[PDB]
Short mmCIF file of N, CA, C and O in Angstrom, two decimals:
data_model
loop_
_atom_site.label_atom_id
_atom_site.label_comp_id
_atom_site.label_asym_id
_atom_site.label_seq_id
_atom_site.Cartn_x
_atom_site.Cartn_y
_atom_site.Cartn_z
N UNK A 589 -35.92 56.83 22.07
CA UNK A 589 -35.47 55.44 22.05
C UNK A 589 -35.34 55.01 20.60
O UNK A 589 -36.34 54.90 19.88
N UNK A 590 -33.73 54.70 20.04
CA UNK A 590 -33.69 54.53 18.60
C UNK A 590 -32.86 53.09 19.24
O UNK A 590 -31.81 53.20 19.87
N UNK A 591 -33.63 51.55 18.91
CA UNK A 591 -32.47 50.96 19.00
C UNK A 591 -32.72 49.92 17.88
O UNK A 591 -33.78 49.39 17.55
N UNK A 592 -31.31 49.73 17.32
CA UNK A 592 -31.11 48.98 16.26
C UNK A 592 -31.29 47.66 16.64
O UNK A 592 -30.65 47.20 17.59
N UNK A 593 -32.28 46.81 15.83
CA UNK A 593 -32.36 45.03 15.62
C UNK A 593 -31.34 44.68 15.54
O UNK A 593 -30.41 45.09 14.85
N UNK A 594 -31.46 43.69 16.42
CA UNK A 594 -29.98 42.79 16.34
C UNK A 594 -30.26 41.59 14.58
O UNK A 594 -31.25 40.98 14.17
N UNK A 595 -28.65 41.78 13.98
CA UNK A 595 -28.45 41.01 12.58
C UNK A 595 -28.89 40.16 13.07
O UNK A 595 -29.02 39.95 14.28
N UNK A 596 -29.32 39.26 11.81
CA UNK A 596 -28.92 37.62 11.87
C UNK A 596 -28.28 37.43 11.38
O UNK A 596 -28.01 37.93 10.29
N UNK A 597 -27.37 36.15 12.29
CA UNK A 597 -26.23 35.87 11.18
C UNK A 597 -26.03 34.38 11.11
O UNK A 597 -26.37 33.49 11.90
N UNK A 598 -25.30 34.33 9.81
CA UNK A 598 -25.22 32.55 9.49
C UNK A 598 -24.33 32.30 9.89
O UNK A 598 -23.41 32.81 9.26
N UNK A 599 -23.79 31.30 11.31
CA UNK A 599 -23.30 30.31 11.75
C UNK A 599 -22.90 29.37 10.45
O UNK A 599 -23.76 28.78 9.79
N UNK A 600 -21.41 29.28 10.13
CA UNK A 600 -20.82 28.40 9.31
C UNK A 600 -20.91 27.06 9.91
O UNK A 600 -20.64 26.90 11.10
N UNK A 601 -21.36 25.91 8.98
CA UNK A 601 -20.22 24.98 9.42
C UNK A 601 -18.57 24.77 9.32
O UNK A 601 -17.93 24.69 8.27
N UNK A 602 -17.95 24.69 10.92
CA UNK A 602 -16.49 25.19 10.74
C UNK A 602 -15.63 23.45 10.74
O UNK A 602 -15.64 22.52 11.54
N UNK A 603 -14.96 23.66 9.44
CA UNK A 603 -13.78 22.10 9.77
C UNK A 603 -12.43 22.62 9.65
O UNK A 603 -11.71 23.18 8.82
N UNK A 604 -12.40 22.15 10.98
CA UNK A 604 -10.73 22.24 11.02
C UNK A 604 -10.49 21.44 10.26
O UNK A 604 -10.60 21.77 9.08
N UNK A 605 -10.12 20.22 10.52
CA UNK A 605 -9.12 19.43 10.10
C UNK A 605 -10.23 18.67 8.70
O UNK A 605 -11.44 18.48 8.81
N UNK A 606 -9.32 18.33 7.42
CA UNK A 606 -10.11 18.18 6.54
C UNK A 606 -10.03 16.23 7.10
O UNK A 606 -9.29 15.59 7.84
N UNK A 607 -11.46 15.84 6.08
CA UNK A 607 -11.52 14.19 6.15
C UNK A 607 -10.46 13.47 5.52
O UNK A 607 -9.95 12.38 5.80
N UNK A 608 -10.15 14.55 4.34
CA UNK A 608 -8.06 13.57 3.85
C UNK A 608 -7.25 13.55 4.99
O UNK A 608 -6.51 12.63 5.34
N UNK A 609 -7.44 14.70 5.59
CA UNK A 609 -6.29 15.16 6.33
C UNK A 609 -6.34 14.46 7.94
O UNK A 609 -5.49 14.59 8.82
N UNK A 610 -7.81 13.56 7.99
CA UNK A 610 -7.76 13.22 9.33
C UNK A 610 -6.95 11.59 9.55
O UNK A 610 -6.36 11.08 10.50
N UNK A 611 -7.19 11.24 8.49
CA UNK A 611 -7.31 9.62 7.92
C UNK A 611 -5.50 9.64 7.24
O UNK A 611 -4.81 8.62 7.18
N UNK A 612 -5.13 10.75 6.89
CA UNK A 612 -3.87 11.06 6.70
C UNK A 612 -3.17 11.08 7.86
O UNK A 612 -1.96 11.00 7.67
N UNK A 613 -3.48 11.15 8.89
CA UNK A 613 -2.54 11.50 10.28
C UNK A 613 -1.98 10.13 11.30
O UNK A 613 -1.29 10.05 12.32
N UNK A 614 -2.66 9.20 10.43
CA UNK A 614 -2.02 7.88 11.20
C UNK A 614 -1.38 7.22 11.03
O UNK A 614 -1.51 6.82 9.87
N UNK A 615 0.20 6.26 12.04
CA UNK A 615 1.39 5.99 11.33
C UNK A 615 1.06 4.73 10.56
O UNK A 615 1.54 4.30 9.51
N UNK A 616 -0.10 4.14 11.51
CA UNK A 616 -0.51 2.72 10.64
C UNK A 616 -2.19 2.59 10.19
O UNK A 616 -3.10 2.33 10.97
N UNK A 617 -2.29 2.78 9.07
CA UNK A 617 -3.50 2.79 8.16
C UNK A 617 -4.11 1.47 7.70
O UNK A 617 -4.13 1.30 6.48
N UNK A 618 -4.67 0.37 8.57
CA UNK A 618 -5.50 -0.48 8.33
C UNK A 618 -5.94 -1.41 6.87
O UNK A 618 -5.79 -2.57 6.49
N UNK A 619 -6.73 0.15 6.22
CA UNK A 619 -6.75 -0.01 4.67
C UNK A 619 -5.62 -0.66 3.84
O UNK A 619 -5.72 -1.66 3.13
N UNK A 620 -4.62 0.04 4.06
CA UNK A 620 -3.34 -0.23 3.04
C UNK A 620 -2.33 -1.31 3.87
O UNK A 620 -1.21 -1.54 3.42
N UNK A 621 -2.71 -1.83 4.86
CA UNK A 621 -1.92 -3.07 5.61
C UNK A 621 -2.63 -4.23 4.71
O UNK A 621 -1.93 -4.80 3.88
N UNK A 622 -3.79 -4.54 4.83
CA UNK A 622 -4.85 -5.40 4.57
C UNK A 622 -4.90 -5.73 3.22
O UNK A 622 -4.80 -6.90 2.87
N UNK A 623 -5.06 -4.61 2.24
CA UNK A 623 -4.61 -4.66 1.21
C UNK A 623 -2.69 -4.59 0.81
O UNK A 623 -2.36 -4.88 -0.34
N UNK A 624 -1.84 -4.28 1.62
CA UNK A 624 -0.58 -4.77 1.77
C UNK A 624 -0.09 -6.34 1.54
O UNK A 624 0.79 -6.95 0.92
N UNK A 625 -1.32 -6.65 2.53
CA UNK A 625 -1.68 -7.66 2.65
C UNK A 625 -1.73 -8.90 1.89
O UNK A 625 -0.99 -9.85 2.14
N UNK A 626 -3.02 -8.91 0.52
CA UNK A 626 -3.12 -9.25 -0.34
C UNK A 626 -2.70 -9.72 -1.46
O UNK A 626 -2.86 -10.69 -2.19
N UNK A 627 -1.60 -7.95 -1.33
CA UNK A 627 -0.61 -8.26 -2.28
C UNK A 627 0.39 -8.96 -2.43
O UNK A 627 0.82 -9.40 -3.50
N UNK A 628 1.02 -9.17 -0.82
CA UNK A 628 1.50 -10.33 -0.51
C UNK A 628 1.14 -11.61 -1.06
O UNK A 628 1.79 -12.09 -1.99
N UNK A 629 0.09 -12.21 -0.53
CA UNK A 629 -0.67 -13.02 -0.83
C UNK A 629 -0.64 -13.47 -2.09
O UNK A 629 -0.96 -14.65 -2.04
N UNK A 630 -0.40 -13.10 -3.36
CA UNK A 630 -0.71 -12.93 -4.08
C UNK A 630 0.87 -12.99 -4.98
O UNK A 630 1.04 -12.07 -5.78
N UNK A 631 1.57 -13.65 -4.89
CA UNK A 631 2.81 -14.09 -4.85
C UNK A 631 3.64 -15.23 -5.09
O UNK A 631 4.61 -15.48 -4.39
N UNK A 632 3.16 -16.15 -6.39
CA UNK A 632 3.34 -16.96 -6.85
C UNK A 632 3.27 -17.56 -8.03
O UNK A 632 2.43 -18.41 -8.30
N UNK A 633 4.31 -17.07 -8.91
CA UNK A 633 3.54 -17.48 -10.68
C UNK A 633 5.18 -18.92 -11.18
O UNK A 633 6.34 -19.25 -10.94
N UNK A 634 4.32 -19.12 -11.73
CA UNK A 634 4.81 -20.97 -12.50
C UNK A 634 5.26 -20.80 -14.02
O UNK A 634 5.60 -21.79 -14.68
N UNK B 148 25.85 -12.65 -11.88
CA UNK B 148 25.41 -11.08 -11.12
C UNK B 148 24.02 -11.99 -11.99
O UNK B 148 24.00 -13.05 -12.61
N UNK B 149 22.59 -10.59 -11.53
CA UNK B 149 21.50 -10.94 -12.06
C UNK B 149 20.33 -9.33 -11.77
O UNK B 149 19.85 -8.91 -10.72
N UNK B 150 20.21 -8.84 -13.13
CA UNK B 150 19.89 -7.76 -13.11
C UNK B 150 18.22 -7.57 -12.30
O UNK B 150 17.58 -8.49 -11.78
N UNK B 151 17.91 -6.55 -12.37
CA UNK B 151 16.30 -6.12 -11.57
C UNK B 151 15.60 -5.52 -12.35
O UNK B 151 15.90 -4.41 -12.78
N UNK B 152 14.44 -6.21 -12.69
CA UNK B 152 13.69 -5.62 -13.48
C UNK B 152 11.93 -5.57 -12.62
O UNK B 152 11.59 -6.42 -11.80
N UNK B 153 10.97 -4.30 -13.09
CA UNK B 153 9.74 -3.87 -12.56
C UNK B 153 9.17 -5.39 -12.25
O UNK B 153 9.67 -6.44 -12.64
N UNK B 154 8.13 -5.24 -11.53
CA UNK B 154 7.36 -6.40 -10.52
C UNK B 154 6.18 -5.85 -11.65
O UNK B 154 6.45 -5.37 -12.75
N UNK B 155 5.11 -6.00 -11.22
CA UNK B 155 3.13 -5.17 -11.45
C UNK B 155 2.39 -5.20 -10.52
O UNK B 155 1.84 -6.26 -10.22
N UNK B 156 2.18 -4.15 -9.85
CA UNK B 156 1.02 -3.61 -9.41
C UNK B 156 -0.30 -2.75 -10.17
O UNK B 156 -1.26 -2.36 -9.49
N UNK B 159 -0.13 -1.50 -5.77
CA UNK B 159 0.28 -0.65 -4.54
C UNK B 159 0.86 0.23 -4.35
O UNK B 159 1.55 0.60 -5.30
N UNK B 160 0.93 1.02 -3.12
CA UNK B 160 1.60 2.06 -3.10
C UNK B 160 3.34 1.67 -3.22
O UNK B 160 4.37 2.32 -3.36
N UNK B 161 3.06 0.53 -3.11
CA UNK B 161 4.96 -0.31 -2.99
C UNK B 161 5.12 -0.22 -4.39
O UNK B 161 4.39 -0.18 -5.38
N UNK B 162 6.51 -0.21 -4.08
CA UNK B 162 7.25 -0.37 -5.80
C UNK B 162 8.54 -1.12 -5.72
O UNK B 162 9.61 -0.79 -5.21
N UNK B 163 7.96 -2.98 -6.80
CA UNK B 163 9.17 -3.56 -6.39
C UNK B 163 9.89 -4.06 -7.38
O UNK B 163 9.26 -3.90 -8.42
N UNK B 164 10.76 -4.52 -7.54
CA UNK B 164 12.13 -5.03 -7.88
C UNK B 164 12.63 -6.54 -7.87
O UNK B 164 13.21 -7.05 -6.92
N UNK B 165 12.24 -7.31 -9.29
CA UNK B 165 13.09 -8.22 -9.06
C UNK B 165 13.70 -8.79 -10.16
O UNK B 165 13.71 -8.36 -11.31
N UNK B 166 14.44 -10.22 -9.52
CA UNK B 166 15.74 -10.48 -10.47
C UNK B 166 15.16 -12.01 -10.81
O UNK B 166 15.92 -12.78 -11.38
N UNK B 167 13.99 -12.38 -10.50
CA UNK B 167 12.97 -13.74 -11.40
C UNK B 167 11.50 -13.70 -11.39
O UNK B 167 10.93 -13.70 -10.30
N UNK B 168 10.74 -13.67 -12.61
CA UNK B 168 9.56 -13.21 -12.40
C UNK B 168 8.71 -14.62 -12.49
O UNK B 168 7.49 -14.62 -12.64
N UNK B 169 9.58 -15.96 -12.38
CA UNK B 169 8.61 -17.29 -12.37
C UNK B 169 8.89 -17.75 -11.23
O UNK B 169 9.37 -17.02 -10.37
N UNK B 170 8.59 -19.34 -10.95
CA UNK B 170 8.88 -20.16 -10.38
C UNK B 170 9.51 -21.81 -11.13
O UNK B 170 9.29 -22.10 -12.30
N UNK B 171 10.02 -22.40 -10.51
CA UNK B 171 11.28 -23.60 -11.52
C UNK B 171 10.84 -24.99 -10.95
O UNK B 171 10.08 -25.18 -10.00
N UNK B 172 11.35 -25.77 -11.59
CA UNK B 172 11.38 -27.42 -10.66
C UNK B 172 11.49 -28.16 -12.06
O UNK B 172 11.19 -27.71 -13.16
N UNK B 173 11.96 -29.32 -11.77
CA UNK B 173 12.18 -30.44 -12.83
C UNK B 173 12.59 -32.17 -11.62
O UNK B 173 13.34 -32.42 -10.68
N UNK B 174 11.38 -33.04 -12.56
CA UNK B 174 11.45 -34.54 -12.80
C UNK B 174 12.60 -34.78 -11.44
O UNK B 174 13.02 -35.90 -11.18
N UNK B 178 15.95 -39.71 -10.00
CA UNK B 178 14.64 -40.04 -9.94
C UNK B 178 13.95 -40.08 -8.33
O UNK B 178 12.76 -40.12 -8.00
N UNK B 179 15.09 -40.05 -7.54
CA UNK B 179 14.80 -40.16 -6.00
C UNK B 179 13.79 -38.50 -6.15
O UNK B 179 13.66 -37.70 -7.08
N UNK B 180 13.25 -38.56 -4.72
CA UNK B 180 12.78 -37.28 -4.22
C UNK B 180 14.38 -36.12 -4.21
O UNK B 180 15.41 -36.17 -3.54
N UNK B 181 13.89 -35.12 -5.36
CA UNK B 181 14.97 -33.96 -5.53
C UNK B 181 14.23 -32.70 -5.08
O UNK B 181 13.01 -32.54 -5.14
N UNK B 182 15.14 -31.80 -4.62
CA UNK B 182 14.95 -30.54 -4.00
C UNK B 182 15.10 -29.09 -4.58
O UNK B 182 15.85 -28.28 -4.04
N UNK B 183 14.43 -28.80 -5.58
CA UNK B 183 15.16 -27.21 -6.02
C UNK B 183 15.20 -26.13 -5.60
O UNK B 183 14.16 -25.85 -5.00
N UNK B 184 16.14 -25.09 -5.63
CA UNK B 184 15.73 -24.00 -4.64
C UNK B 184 15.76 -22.72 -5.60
O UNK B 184 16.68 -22.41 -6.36
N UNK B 185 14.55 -22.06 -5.38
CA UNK B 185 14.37 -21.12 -6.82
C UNK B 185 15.12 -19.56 -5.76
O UNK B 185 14.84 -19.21 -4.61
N UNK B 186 15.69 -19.21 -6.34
CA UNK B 186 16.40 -17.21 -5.61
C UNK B 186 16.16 -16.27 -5.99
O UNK B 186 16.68 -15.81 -7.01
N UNK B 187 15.32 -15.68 -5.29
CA UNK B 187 15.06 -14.46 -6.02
C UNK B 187 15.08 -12.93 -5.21
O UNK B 187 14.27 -12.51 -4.38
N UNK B 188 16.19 -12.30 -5.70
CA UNK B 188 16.35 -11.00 -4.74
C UNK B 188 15.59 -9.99 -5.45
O UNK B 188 15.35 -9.90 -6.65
N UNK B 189 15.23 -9.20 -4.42
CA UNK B 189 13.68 -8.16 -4.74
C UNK B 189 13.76 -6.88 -3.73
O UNK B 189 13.41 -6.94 -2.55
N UNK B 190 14.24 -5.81 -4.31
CA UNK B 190 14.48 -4.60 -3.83
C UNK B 190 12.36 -3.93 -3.86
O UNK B 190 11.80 -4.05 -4.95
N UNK B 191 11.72 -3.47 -2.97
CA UNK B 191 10.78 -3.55 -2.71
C UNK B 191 10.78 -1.91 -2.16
O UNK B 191 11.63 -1.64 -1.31
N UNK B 192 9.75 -0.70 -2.67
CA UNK B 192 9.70 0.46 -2.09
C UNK B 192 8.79 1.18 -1.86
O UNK B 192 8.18 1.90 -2.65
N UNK B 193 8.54 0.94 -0.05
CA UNK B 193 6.99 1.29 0.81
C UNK B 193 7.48 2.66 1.18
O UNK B 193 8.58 3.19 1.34
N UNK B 194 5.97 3.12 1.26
CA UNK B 194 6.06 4.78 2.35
C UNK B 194 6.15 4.43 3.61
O UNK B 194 5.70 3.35 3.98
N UNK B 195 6.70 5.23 4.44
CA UNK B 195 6.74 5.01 5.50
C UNK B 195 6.31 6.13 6.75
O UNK B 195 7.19 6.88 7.16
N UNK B 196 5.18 6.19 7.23
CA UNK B 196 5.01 7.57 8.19
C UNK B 196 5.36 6.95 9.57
O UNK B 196 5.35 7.66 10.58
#
């Protein structure tokens, strides 16, 4: 009876999709309306 | 005619042809200030 130990092995943490790339995928982005927004706002010189 | 010159900042990039606002002084008078503004958003 010769039996080989089972490895250990390191379990990656796996990311698909990156955090730019998730926040990148939407047609309307909140952030840049709001601040769109602002800039609007912001629209009046004398 | 009335040329276009840079705005200041967004990701927008705009364009215009008056960078103030106008009015002058005997009845109640009305001025109307014009200002055309070529304006350039991303769009997904």
């Amino acid at each position: 009876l010769d039996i080989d130990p089972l490895e250990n092995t390191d379990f990656r943490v796996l990311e698909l999709y990156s955090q730019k790339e998730l926040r990148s995928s939407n047609v309307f982005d909140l952030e840049e309306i709001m601040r769109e927004f602002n800039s609007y706002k912001q629209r009046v010189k004398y | 005619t009335m040329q276009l010159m840079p705005d200041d900042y967004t990701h927008s990039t705009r364009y215009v042809t008056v960078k103030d606002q106008w009015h002058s002084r005997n009845l109640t008078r009305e001025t109307s200030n014009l200002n055309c503004m070529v304006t350039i958003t991303t769009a997904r």
